[PDB]
Amino acid sequence: TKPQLAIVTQWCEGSSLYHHLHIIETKFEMIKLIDIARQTAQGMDYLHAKSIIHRDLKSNNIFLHEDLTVKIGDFGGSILWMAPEVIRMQDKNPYSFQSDVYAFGIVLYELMTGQLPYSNINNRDQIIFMVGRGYLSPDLSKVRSNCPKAMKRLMAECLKKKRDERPLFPQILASIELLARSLPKI
Amino acid sequence: MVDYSVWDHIEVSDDEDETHPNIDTASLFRWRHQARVERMEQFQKEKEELDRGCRECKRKVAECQRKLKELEVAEGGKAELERLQAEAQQLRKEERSWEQKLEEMRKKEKSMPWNVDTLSKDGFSKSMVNTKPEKTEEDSEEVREQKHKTFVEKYEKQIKHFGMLRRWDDSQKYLSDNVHLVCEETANYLVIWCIDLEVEEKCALMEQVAHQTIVMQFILELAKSLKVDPRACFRQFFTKIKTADRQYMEGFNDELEAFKERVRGR
Amino acid sequence: EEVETFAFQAEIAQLMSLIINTFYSNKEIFLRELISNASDALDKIRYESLTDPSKLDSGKELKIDIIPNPQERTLTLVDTGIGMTKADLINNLGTIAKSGTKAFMEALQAGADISMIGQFGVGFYSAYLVAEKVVVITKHNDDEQYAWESSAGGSFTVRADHGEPIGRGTKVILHLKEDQTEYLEERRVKEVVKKHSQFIGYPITLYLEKEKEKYIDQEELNKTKPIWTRNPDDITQEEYGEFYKSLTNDWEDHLAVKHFSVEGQLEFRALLFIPRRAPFDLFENKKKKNNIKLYVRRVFIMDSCDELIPEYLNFIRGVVDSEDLPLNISREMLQQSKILKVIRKNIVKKCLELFSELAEDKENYKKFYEAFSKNLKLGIHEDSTNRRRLSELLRYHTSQSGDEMTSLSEYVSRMKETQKSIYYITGESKEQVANSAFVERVRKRGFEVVYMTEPIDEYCVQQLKEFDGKSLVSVTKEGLELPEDEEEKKKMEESKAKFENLCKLMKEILDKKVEKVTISNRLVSSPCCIVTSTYGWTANMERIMKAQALRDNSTMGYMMAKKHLEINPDHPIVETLRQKAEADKNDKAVKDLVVLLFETALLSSGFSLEDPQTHSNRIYRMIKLGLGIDE
Amino acid sequence: EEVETFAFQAEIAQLMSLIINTFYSNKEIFLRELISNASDALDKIRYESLTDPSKLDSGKELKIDIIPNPQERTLTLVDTGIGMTKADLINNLGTIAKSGTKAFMEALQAGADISMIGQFGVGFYSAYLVAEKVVVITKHNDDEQYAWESSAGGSFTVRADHGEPIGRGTKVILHLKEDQTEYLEERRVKEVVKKHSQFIGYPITLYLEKEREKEKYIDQEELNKTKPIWTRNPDDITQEEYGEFYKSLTNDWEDHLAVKHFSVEGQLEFRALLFIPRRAPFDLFENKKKKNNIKLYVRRVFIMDSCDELIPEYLNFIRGVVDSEDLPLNISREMLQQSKILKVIRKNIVKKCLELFSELAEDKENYKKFYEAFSKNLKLGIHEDSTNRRRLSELLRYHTSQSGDEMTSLSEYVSRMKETQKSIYYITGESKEQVANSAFVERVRKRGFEVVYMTEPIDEYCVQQLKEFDGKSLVSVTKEGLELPEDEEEKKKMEESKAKFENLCKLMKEILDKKVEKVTISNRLVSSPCCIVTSTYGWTANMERIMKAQALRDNSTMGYMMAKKHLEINPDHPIVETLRQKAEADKNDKAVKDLVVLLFETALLSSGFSLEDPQTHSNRIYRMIKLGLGIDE
Ligand SMILES: Nc1ncnc2c1ncn2[C@@H]1O[C@H](COP(=O)(O)OP(=O)(O)OP(=O)(O)O)[C@@H](O)[C@H]1O
Ligand SMILES: Nc1ncnc2c1ncn2[C@@H]1O[C@H](COP(=O)(O)OP(=O)(O)OP(=O)(O)O)[C@@H](O)[C@H]1O
């Protein structure tokens, strides 16, 4: 004789983004692959404007929430997101904003290629030494058929050789937004 | 006057009203806390370094004063004296620079804000548990008789003052101090009061007093169903009967009519 | 080359209009302002008395009256304070932004037992929010009696008068408006006075007219003195309880109490409380929360529990009185909102210490736990800072303690030598889970399982992942491993090859549904059971999620987990099933038996069947066959 | 006797101290105030040129500029407006509570056609909140260039200045202090301008210094580019403009679905603009999120966006703007006073939003998309709202027993019922397959009647309140005492059959032992031996399941008041007839007990309820499997 009222929920841990692209297929269209790449760029810009660094952004750290909402976090081999300066052994402080930029670039490569980087050689010690000296890099030919050219320029810029000729995040965000609001199909 | 310039630089590490829709909080708090602790420890290293350097420099200054007193009787040491004078003067001027740096550093640790553990330091604190014997209920028949006589007489005067009215909010506050005071014996005397009002054949007074009495007895019967005393259950039925729905209103009306017929036939 | 200086001026008419029509929101705070002024005057005369008693020969008591009159529209507010002289009357009551209290405080020695309200200046002009003409009558010790009259225009008249003597106080006569004649009704006056100014140290009284028609003197406007100001070594239990009854309208008393106070730059004094039984509309929200108030010099400022305590500690009542803070022009809000978040930390810390102290005696903890247990598990879900201190007040039923709840740290004591990790199970009732298929093996080797039988337990156990370096492992998730002997391992390895053929055939009959069928070691006396996979929902969580009213559905398929089947290689039924499958490749009886076995396994492992009519028909056919009826 | 008249006065230093640091929070506000002073100035020169030109020989265009200087810690706010003379630099900027806008509006001949911000006269000292030294340089059409300068506290200097040519306008220079030196950057200024004042009618520009390859200066006028649309006439706008505004007001990669645009020219004046998102946001049913859907705007200046009562709870997806012209406002321009007009605004908005909902229900292609996403929010209006229930129940579209994959409506279903029928039949279940071939709807679907399906929790929450339609009552097919109007020959046959199945009733009630409160015989089944129905007053099965499953229950009270149930059997099935024949002879046998327990348990299983202890039933099934295969023992 005294009804009720519907009650709201709290939240839940949505699926990780490494599950979507590596253990399942979950292939989206080209437009949505753009929107996710923009969301991770904006969020890292906010952290980088208060002197907070992250030290790693493994693709499983990214949590593709309900509907579509990217949320970087920290909860945690991972020698595939590291910079050619992290694997050094001097001064115990190689970390800077450019290393975050490099990790973001590798995330972008995984995101539009659809495959794990360095699929050719399978030896951890060999890979770490090779990145050390006689350095290599992922081959850029492995791309989607309809992938644009504006970002292929952005990817090559994020990981060149060194920490002095790498961009900062406002330029990357501006480039991604410019490419985003120009793309019906290509 | 009215200067509020001191409360301008407070800092909290777990603030929830500044976040980004692309960072999950949770881990943001840990980052902020770690940065604050690291900065505090760096400044503490600097301040303790300056303090211990000043202490050892004062000890060495006392030692140099003792050496000067010794040389007041002795002779020969000039190059050492000149080197000590030059080094000590340069060290003292750079220490004055460092002291001014610390004096500005206090103003900066005002600009770099107060944290939680600089604003206040604790005083006294006490805590009790109230281990009371929560079991108190006197014999049913004796309480019935004594409450009947005393409480039923006094609150019968009260209920005779109250029953000639029909208001709800007045009835609400009257039941508030009733559940402060009254018990089931007052309810039984209200029942017999309605019963002997039936014999007196006051139709409109029957309608009003029966309205109030059936509301109270519905409180009573809900109490019987839940075994929770009428003292403890007054606000919920009142707030659901003042905002009673149409279906609840017609149910209440039909139950009122049924109870009126039952009492008239009783 | 002709720089010339000037001085800042002020325009008066716009200033007054702006003040009295813009500063404040409500129209009910004028009573608060007037009461504050009267309290200050009484404080002044009281302080001045205790050096020479020659200043109290005209009026010995200190009081405050309220006299309404609904025939002439007046709201007189007589008091017996210090009074004002002519020069002071002109210079403070007729000069905006100048206060006479600050001068008295500054000239007064250095440090005294005085603490007064008011330093701004624009406070008495708030009477013109609801008023048309105000009159003030005053008398001091060393002057005559004077009358002040104005109408919030641009002038005021001050004259000497003869009339009714007062001792030494001040009268404020208020001629009310035409559309605001609802402040001469007594329920409204009582509500305003009780909400705003009820801890003033002096006896406010009313002067109503009830029924000769008498003259009533109801003093009950405030008769509950503040108790947090005095020493904590002189309050004796019962004194607390009364203050609790007259604070929030209860018929019972409390169960615990804290009386702490911090010092430094930001200082306050708190009186937190814990109730006996939970209110039945605790999670109804909607209504503004008023369980913790905030006072400055014993005058209400603002109430809130959305920013002073977290959302899972809304059952605690108290008082947070302080001494000085950065207030607004209308003392109804606080600049620098970070002070509130600083206060919240100390409140939370003291509350947790109180809980830990109360959990010592194991006789009153049960009463607190059986009525306030959901809030703790709500806190574990969203509180990263203190989740280790809140994970030790958890009591669980366990299968080595009959009808008494045990603690989590007590569990880790009575473990075995080779045991790692804690075992748990989540169900819907305490007897549905006591005798299930999964438990029937680990409970035969002397191990322990805890019983988490409630809806919020899943929300808790999803976040708390380890305790004291031990891992929480469930009994229903794709291949738990428990310490065992080597010989058992060799025998199980042989049996795995023994049953390697029927296992594939069942996967053939059962299409997309199960995902892999395997031999298991978790059963001793049941044919088969269903387990889920590591990364995904469990059965109970799926059951809870499918019953939420306001939640979307387009993400259900992404989260659900697959299910495996466990064939136990000792029951006779499985032994004969292998016999049948060995000779015949496909017979109707084998198909029917496999389907029925899977269906009962689904029914007994917490899952909900998607078409009960088929199962019912299958049961009815067998009932018919074994008792006669042909068709 | 003697009467002395006086006049009021003030204390200047204390008043200034009150102004600076008592009724201004969120320091950033200062910038807004300064901008709101430039715009007004510009407006004046746009009004003196309408009657006659040749008051614009000094400047042609109107603009607002911002120049930050990171080296001397200054921030300039150049503006080419009307200007100020010498007699107005001492009577306007050197007197508390004195404005020049109000005196300007007084002299007009009630022609209106102008609207300027501010009438109180304290808004320069908000700019004083952040700086320690303020300098003003001004020029007018009939004076010489003059320079104001102050550092707070009973002083200001008004010397003459010959050091720079300014055509016509004003120039405000702030000397920042060491603590607050974050307003010289790009992000802070950009955010403050974009959030507080971006719909001002003039081109705010910025002059920051960049580096390219080298101190080359940059012109970033994009501080405001989107113009206010809601001031135009509704008929003269196209769809692409609306889409562009919606996109660059809440960032989203898709346009809108429907848009409303109205005005209210009564004693109260406001114009609104409401949209409808194409896809529902993910976190729209949370606890305490900072709601921001409808934003207020008094004269194109942001006031507040949270509000308590502007739209009711269930209308949350609606997003847009609401512009007014006059409201009771505080001294800080962030809070509303006495909150009475909000009721009128809320009523009007609700009415027009419902009008839009009804208008959209004509085409049969967009309504499917709207209803697939925002269906839940309509089934809250029937629950909470009580004066709009009648016209909110037409927009509900359910499945049915005659439409394969097509959602029909209640009004369509009313116009398809046969003459004899007098009520609507519905069934509340868990899924659509589980509800399609159940046992309750077996007689009503053989006569040829129509039942409506309802498979979701919010359907229970709504149906519990909606009890009528066109003066017809809804009756469920899973409750006690459901009557199908039919001829009394079969009713007499049922009465005759109600006498030979009498002893079995009391035998079954005795054996089940206070688990069922009645065991009657009834007419709702054709091919099923048993089915369990609940009482007429009390929770149904599925409602009880939903009540139990949810968290935060407070389950002390609910457990011991609900869940009444019955049982009913059919006199046609061979099982029941054989059972009656068998129990006729021996009233203390053994097989009958096992059989009745099995029947009751299976009927409980396939009717929505949940078993109390699932192990016993499974063991019984296993035992029968074992005995029907010859394992014995
Ligand atoms: N009833 C009164 N008795 C004595 N002095 C009074 C009385 N009412 C006002 N005053 C005088 O008025 C002056 C202050 O007036 P006003 O209320 O405007 O300022 P305030 O005390 O700072 O403000 P508030 O109302 O917040 O306390 C003081 O000089 C005080 O002595
Ligand atoms: N840039 C300007 N150009 C011309 N007149 C100005 C300028 N800035 C201020 N004024 C003048 O200063 C006087 C007082 O302005 P003040 O800031 O004190 O309040 P207001 O104009 O009433 O309000 P607000 O600043 O909120 O618009 C007015 O006469 C106004 O015209």
Author numbering:
A (entry chain K): 521 to 596, 615 to 724
B (entry chain C): 1 to 266
C (entry chain B): 10 to 220, 273 to 692
D (entry chain A): 10 to 222, 273 to 692
Q: Which sentences from the paper describe this structure?
A:
Activation of client protein kinases by the HSP90 molecular chaperone system is affected by phosphorylation at multiple sites on HSP90, the kinase-specific co-chaperone CDC37, and the kinase client itself.
The structure of the HSP90–CDC37–BRAFV600E complex consists of two molecules of human HSP90β arranged in the ATP-bound closed conformation originally observed in a complex of yeast HSP90 and the co-chaperone P23/Sba1. The polypeptide chain for both HSP90β molecules can be traced through more or less continuous, ordered density from Glu10 to Glu692, with the exception of the low-complexity ‘linker segment’ from approximately 220–275 which connects the N-terminal and central domains. Serine 13, whose phosphorylation and targeted dephosphorylation are critical for client kinase activation by HSP906,7,23, is clearly phosphorylated within the complex and engaged with the side chains of CDC37 residues His33 and Arg36, and Lys406 of HSP90 as previously seen in the cryoEM structure of the HSP90–CDC37–CDK4 complex. One consequence of the interaction of CDC37–Trp31 with BRAFV600E is to force the catalytically important DFG motif, into a quite different conformation to that found in the folded active kinase, with the following activation segment containing the oncogenic V600E mutated residue, being disordered. The molecular details of the interaction of the DFG motif of BRAFV600E with CDC37 in the complex provide a satisfactory explanation for how the oncogenic mutation of Val600 within the early part of the activation loop, converts BRAF from a weakly dependent HSP90 client with only moderate affinity for CDC371, into a highly dependent client which is rapidly degraded when cells are treated with HSP90 inhibitors.
